[PDB]
Design a protein around this ligand. Structure first.
Ligand code: MG
Ligand code: MG
Ligand code: MG
Ligand code: MG
Ligand code: ZN
Ligand code: ZN
Lengths: 39, 87, 38, 97, 146, 99, 94, 177, 160
């Protein structure tokens, strides 16, 4: 659905600049934010 | 020997019954099936009636042998090729 | 019949008929004109 | 009166969207088979009833054809294997759940 | 219509006929099909329409009487032959292999003993190039050759 | 040298297996695989083929829910295409925007 | 005890007997066994889904290769449902 | 499902006997769906090494229909390997000799060309007419829908629909017809 | 009286697929509200057990449940036995209901709690390249780092 994602402006690859790929993967159980990911 | 004869339903005879020669009659026509006289392993000369090779005129050890069995292009021998065997 | 690729009418009695998937020129007065499309 | 799919084989699917429009909620309770759709469960004077223990030994051929007819296979599955493969088999395979 | 009776006496008599259905959706059309909005929306199955256009014994009716334009007439003719071969007209007969979409007469085609290479393959005709232009209702066009 | 190329081949074959299983389940629900995948993407659910197959096998009711959602999105797309005007976009055709 | 089945830990002999006892002691009509689903039957690999109903209400279902073992499995499923030690139950809280 | 492990495995991997009807269906479409079922590609647990095929029982194979002129075009070729074993029979001749051969050959062609093909063909069952053996009939589940729709000959049309379809043209009163 | 555009019923006068009419938006919206309320009260009461989730992590999508194990193909900068919260939950479900994110569910709605329990290395992997008649041959042995995480809990909260 690359063309549809482009039409909506959400890249073409769902791994591109979306919240899905840019939000932190995890955090500590008490709530402390995780150190930033390398990618 | 027991042999199986195909009959129509009006020709059934009770099992256990004796059959004799007069079941046939003169001036009739019949077909007779039997195992032919076994000749053992035989060459192409007797089994298939090939012409073989001439005796004299320089021939090396071939007077009673099959010639070419196939052609060059065929990298095999055709099934059903006439070759020596039990006759 | 004669085999032809291009069939031609040579008489005014010649007629074209398509039979068995092929065209034919049949002439009843001049049978030498019988033609079969090839 | 509109259902995305027929509603009579697995579950009663009901789709919904939250008010903010950010998440989809699916309600899928199971569909149970009707009792009406089921079917009921199917159902020497003088001597012992001697147990009828006959086991005719079939030679390998007719044996293998009987097995192949019984299980709808070919004969090759039933023909045996050599010592090389028999020893190559793992007799203590790993087992998860 | 008109019938001729033989008894020697031969006589012609007029029988009742159907007229045109009251209100065509497109009165401006020049051809029965064009007038009822069916140009590309009938197939060999539409034996109702085909029967409206055929003779009692399976023959076609001429254009100058049916009012059909050449293009529609020829499409009717082809559909009628196809339906006859499929056996969808059991009562318009003259005087076992199940078929459908049969373009050629069954007794005039030779078997494909030698299919060609996959680049010059001899294909098997199905359907009709005249009905090529029918409405598709699908994302893949008709396969006129198998 | 095969242990090295078989890595690529393993990835490709696993994806093909997922696609085949997903097609099986989708046809079980009367849907086709392209329709299912495309309409899930349009609905903005980004489950990959691996978990789609996992749900088809182990979570049949959830998979039926997904198939229903995709079928509804397809119907909404057909409705919008036929309308061709400016009718309301459709409940499940709405796009959540991020900034 | 994490990941095992109730009747994998606690062995029982007659699940149908235990089930009818439990239903009787909580005042429920005795279960009726019915053939909900069937595949094969004449072959050597049949599949029988036997459902246990109470008052024409399905209380359990179970598969098997024979009708009797399918019925026994349905009895075990009903026991698991009644005692709450089911597969999809709420997992332990640590 | 709270099933026990062994019955759960049995239920998941059990075989299913599907029924299919010929009777004016294309052999190719019949073969396609039958081959899918025989391979087990319809199951989401499918895998080539899991032996997940299903039984397919096809009936009225004597009454299949070929589109176009396939009855006379399509040629089935075989070779008894003796010099001159090359035989070619049209679809009509093959159907006349054997009423199930055409469907059998189509399914065989569509099956994957590996060592499981003959096992799948062993699970396939074909019958030329309405008669089905009683054990198979007692095994059957799920008659699958037919691919084609049997276009319903003219004499099979009811008077309601016959009169509901408009008449297209007005014939002249003086035409013999 | 035939409408200007009426087509007589033929095999292909109409599309083969059945005609579908979608529910009207207003009644459908109130229906969605009722359904969401029902699922919410199910969550509030607790009429569920053994939740499962589809979670995005390390570029992968995992279908996990409680008491689970997963193997991540890299080091995670975490000491052994450390509790963390998996957050990018694409999906959460149970028996009779499931919740779908677009594409991610709100963190107020669901928590995944996991525990780093092992930090290990993979078995040695072989990379051999060979080209014939050119004397081309290379061998390399690698051991990718790995992290074993145990999924402890999946929790949902009434927020729909
Ligand atoms: Mg001599
Ligand atoms: Mg010498
Ligand atoms: Mg000599
Ligand atoms: Mg790829
Ligand atoms: Zn002439
Ligand atoms: Zn016209």
């Amino acid at each position: 659905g690359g063309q549809w994602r482009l039409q909506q402006g959400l890249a073409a690859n769902p791994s591109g600049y979306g919240p899905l790929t840019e939000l932190p993967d995890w955090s500590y159980a008490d709530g402390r934010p995780a150190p930033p990911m390398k990618g | 020997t027991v042999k199986i004869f195909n009959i129509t339903d009006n020709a059934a005879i009770k099992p256990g019954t004796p059959l004799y020669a007069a079941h046939f009659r003169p001036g009739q026509y019949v077909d007779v099936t039997a195992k032919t006289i076994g000749k053992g392993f035989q060459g192409v000369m007797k089994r298939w009636g090939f012409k073989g090779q001439p005796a004299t005129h320089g021939q090396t050890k071939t007077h009673r042998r099959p010639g070419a069995v196939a052609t060059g292009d065929i990298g095999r021998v055709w099934p059903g090729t006439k070759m020596p065997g039990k006759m | 019949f004669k085999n032809k690729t291009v069939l031609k009418k040579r008489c005014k009695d010649c007629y074209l008929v398509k039979r068995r998937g092929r065209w034919y020129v049949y002439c009843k007065t001049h049978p030498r004109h019988k033609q079969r499309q090839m | 009166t509109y259902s995305p799919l027929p509603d009579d084989y697995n579950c009663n699917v009901e789709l919904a969207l939250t008010s903010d429009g950010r998440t989809i909620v699916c309600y899928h309770p199971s569909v149970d088979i009707p009792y009406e759709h089921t079917k009921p469960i199917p159902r020497d004077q003088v001597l012992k009833t001697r147990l009828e223990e006959k086991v005719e030994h079939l030679e390998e051929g007719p044996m293998i054809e009987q097995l192949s007819k019984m299980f709808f296979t070919t004969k090759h599955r039933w023909y045996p294997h050599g010592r090389y493969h028999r020893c190559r088999k793992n007799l203590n395979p790993p087992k998860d759940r | 219509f008109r019938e001729v009776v033989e008894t020697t006496i031969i006589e012609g008599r007029i029988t009742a006929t159907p007229k045109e259905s009251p209100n065509p959706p497109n009165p401006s059309g020049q051809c029965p099909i064009c007038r009822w909005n069916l140009k590309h929306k009938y197939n060999y199955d539409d034996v109702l329409l085909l029967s409206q256009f055929i003779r009692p014994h399976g023959g076609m009716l001429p254009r100058k009487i049916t009012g059909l334009c050449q293009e529609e007439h020829r499409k009717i003719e082809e559909c009628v032959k196809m339906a006859h071969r499929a056996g969808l007209l059991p009562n318009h007969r003259p005087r076992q292999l199940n078929r459908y979409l049969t373009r050629w007469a069954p007794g005039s085609v030779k078997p494909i003993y030698k299919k060609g290479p996959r680049w010059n393959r001899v294909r098997m005709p199905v359907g009709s190039p005249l009905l090529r232009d029918n409405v598709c209702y699908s994302r893949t066009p008709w396969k006129l050759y198998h | 040298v095969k242990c090295t190329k078989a890595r690529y081949l393993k990835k490709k074959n696993m994806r093909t297996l997922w696609i085949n299983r997903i097609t099986a389940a989708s046809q079980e629900h009367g849907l086709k695989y392209p329709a299912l995948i495309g309409n899930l993407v349009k609905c903005q659910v980004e489950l990959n083929r691996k978990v789609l197959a996992d749900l088809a096998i182990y979570e049949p009711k959830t998979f039926k829910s997904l198939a229903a959602l995709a079928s509804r999105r397809r119907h909404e797309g057909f409705a919008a295409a036929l309308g061709d005007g400016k009718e309301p976009e459709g409940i499940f055709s709405r796009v959540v925007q991020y900034h | 005890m994490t990941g095992k089945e109730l009747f994998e830990m606690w062995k029982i002999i007659n699940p149908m007997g235990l089930l009818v006892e439990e239903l009787k002691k909580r005042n429920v009509s005795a279960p009726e066994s019915r053939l909900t689903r069937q595949s094969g039957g004449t072959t050597a690999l049949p599949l029988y889904f036997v459902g246990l109903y109470c008052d024409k209400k399905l209380i359990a279902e179970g598969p098997g290769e024979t009708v009797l073992v399918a019925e026994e499995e349905a009895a075990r499923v009903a026991l698991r449902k009644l005692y709450g030690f089911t597969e999809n139950r709420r997992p332990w809280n640590y | 499902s709270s099933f026990s492990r062994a019955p759960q495995q049995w239920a998941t991997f059990a075989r299913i006997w599907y029924l299919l009807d010929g009777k004016m269906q294309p052999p190719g479409k019949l073969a396609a769906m039958a081959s899918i079922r025989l391979q087990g590609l319809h199951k989401p647990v499918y895998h080539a090494l899991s032996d997940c095929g299903d039984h397919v029982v096809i009936m009225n194979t004597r009454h299949i229909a070929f589109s176009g002129n396939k009855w006379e075009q399509k040629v089935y070729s075989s070779h008894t390997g003796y010099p001159g074993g090359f035989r070619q029979v049209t679809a009509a001749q093959l159907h006349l000799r054997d009423p199930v051969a055409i469907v059998k050959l189509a399914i065989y062609g569509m099956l994957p060309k590996n060592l499981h093909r003959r096992t799948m063909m062993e699970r396939l069952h074909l019958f030329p007419d309405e008669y089905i053996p009683e054990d198979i009939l007692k095994n059957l589940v799920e008659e699958l829908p037919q691919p084609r729709k049997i276009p319903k000959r003219l004499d099979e049309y009811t008077q309601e629909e016959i009169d509901a379809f408009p008449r297209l043209w007005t014939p002249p009163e003086d035409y013999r017809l | 009286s035939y409408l200007p555009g009426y087509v007589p019923k033929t095999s292909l006068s109409s599309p083969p697929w059945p005609e579908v009419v979608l529910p009207d938006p207003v009644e459908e919206t109130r229906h969605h509200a009722e359904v969401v309320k029902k699922v919410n009260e199910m969550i509030v009461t607790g009429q569920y057990g053994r939740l499962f989730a589809v979670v995005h992590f390390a570029s992968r999508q995992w279908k996990v449940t409680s008491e689970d194990l997963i193997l991540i193909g890299n080091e995670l900068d975490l000491a052994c036995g450390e509790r963390i919260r998996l957050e990018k939950v694409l999906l959460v479900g149970a028996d009779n209901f499931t919740l779908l994110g677009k594409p991610l569910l709100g963190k107020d709605l669901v928590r995944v709690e996991a525990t780093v329990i092992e930090k290990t290395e993979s078995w040695p992997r072989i990379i051999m390249r060979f080209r014939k008649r050119k004397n081309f041959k290379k061998k390399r042995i690698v051991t990718t780092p790995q992290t074993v995480l145990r999924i402890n809990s999946i929790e949902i909260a009434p927020c729909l």
